[PDB]
């Protein structure tokens, strides 16, 4: 299948990913500024798992401490989305995703933001991704060399590069008969970038309604 050293790496993110929610949106029935507590709780569950994965990433710990932070703060939103897609398509039984979308359309959170979220999820759903793909891709998002306020850009590449070479070769053998598939997956990294803009804009609106955020979210997003 794959190289000696590469198999060990692949076989280590992936276990890392296996081991560190929705249903309250599904029933007490609710959309919200009134239910905002549910949101921040979810985001906070996302941020906590983001951090616990990023530690486990090979060489992450060796980076400058401020660069470390920038990568985290730089990647919260993208990972929050990329993880939701694995929940939405890969893990929820039939019918749950349908009510979920519709509950959300009812949120009073406007389609300008809602429609891109759902089109992105479908598109990646239709991509039929394995756990290895979701895991590895998550780790590529996090190790994005170009994030703002990074001091030593070249250190972060050299750390992402290895993950990218696993994933190409992975696609090559387990979506053989689809050589474009590896480019498709990468486009999803491009696709995710846009949500930060939307975040910023949504975040700003919530401060003008004086909403409460958890400690953690306070730190990760400078509120």
């Amino acid at each position: 299948e794959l190289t000696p050293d590469q198999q060990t790496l692949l076989h280590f993110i992936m276990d890392s990913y296996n081991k560190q929610i929705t249903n309250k949106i599904l029933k007490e029935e609710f959309s919200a500024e009134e239910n905002f507590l549910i949101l921040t709780e979810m985001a906070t569950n996302h941020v906590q798992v983001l951090v616990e994965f990023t530690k486990k990433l090979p060489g992450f710990q060796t980076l400058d401490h401020e660069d470390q932070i920038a990568l985290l703060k730089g990647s919260a939103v993208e990972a929050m989305f990329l993880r939701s897609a694995e929940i939405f398509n890969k893990k929820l039984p039939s019918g749950h995703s349908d009510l979920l979308e519709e509950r959300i359309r009812n949120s009073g959170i406007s389609d300008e933001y809602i429609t891109p979220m759902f089109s992105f999820y479908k598109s990646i759903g239709e991509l039929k991704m394995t756990q290895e793909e979701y895991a590895l891709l998550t780790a590529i998002v996090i190790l994005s060399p170009d994030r703002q306020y990074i001091k030593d850009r070249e250190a972060v590449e050299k750390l992402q590069e290895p993950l990218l070479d696993v994933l190409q070769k992975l696609c090559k053998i387990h979506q053989p008969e689809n050589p474009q598939h590896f480019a498709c997956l990468l486009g999803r990294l491009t696709e995710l970038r846009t949500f930060n803009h939307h975040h910023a804009e949504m975040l700003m609106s919530w401060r003008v309604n004086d909403h409460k955020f958890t400690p953690l979210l306070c730190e990760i997003w400078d509120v």
């Binding site: 951090v51 530690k55 710990q61 401490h65 470390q68 985290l72 953690l216 730190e219 990760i220």
Partner: peptide
């Protein structure tokens, strides 16, 4: 700042 992030990372 980012006291909590540093903590959660330095473990």
């Amino acid at each position: 700042e980012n006291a909590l992030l540093r903590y959660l990372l330095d473990k």
